[PDB]
Design a protein around this ligand. Structure first.
Ligand SMILES: *[C@@H]1O[C@H](CO)[C@@H](O[C@@H]2O[C@H](CO)[C@@H](O)[C@H](O)[C@H]2NC(C)=O)[C@H](O)[C@H]1NC(C)=O
Ligand code: NA
Lengths: 35, 64, 257
């Protein structure tokens, strides 16, 4: 481990993804992929 | 790095003609009133970095 | 960040502030990619036009920070080592504008401190399309210019803005600067309805995109350079992280590192 801890859980926010809660604007990002 | 408007003649790495950088190897001749700026070949002086934001509370001594 | 808004608490737990140690001032943004590695732009550390060439002794990073006091939640760290990409070309308008900072000691993660993911081949294939929006965050100026003092444009809380990827031909036609494959641009077109850009002080910080496939956030870009902030018909430019991933892995995987 020269990278250290953190790769396996990277990118999942404790206050958002981990709680299945969405932030105030991430919907705009997904709309840009779909619409 | 954000290039912002040249503020003195002879500067470079700053916006000179419109929203275009006047790069290294050139220098900005600032127009007076009614004159356009011109980015010409020549040795310029980079426009200096703007004052960094130092308006945070002082961090404790441990972090020298 | 121009035309942004105040970030929610915990929105960007990978956000890092790079600070000069003395005098204490904000230099750049950066991002946490593990418990001991920070990613930023090379020009935040080495920029000969400003006689800038920092050593580890000159710098600190702050992680976990949301707002200026006007507690137990931020971490201040020293750096062990700086790594700048071997082919960073500050004469070639910041081609390969990427650097890694090794933290002096591994940090604990928390609700406010957590690493972002780096993209792989599939992530780049899925997410990098013109019109898809990503998100830029930072502590930089809220406008390019001010009337009286720069303090006018300084934010009290981390700012965020979402911005669309722009087609490469449009990026190239928007500037006379030579754009390489190691850069991309983002931002709204004039009369697209909305605005927004990174600005001074946001350089080095992350452009992230959320994958719908695995619900995770990936850092696709590093704020690199702009001609002004939020000017109509101009776009901000970002280091293309995936294009430089082989170097990141090399550095991280080195036995000494
Ligand atoms: C920026 O400064 C560093 C020194 O911190 C320069 O790097 C090399 O650094 C080592 C360690 O100090 C020295 O032995 C030499 O000066 C260089 N390496 C060797 C052994 O060849 C770096 O050159 C500076 N860069 C610029 C463009 O100013
Ligand atoms: Na613009």
């Amino acid at each position: 481990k020269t990278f250290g801890a953190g790769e396996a859980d990277c990118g999942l926010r404790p206050l958002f993804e981990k709680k299945q809660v969405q932030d105030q604007t991430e919907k705009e990002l997904f709309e840009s992929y779909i619409e | 790095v954000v290039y912002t408007d040249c503020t003195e003649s002879g500067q470079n790495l700053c916006l000179x003609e419109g929203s275009n950088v006047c790069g290294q190897g050139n220098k900005x001749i600032l127009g007076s009133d009614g004159e356009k700026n011109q980015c010409v070949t020549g040795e310029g002086t980079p426009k200096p970095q703007s004052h960094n934001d130092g308006d945070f509370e002082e961090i404790p001594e441990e972090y020298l | 960040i121009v035309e942004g808004q105040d970030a929610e608490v915990g929105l960007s737990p990978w956000q890092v502030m790079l600070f000069r140690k003395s005098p204490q001032e904000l230099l750049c943004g950066a991002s946490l990619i593990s418990d001991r590695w920070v990613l930023t732009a090379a020009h935040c550390l080495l920029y000969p036009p400003w006689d800038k060439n920092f050593t580890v002794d000159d710098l600190l990073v702050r992680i976990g920070k949301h707002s200026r006091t006007r507690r137990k939640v931020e971490k201040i760290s020293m750096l062990d080592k700086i790594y700048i990409h071997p082919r960073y070309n500050w004469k070639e308008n910041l081609d390969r504008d990427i650097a890694l900072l090794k933290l002096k000691r591994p940090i604990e993660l928390s609700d406010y401190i957590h690493p972002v993911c780096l993209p792989d081949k599939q992530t780049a294939a899925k997410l990098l399309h013109a019109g898809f929006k990503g998100r830029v965050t930072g502590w930089g100026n809220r406008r390019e210019t001010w009337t009286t003092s720069v303090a006018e444009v300084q934010p009290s809380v981390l700012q965020v803005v979402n911005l669309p990827l722009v087609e490469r031909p449009v990026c190239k036609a928007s500037t006379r600067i030579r754009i390489t494959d190691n850069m991309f641009c983002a931002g709204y077109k004039p009369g697209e309805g909305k605005r927004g850009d990174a600005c001074e002080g946001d350089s080095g910080g992350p452009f992230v995109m959320k994958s719908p496939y695995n619900n995770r956030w990936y850092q696709m870009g590093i704020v690199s350079w702009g001609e002004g902030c939020d000017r109509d018909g101009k776009y901000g430019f970002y280091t293309h992280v995936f294009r430089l991933k082989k170097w990141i892995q090399k550095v991280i995987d080195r036995l000494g590192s």
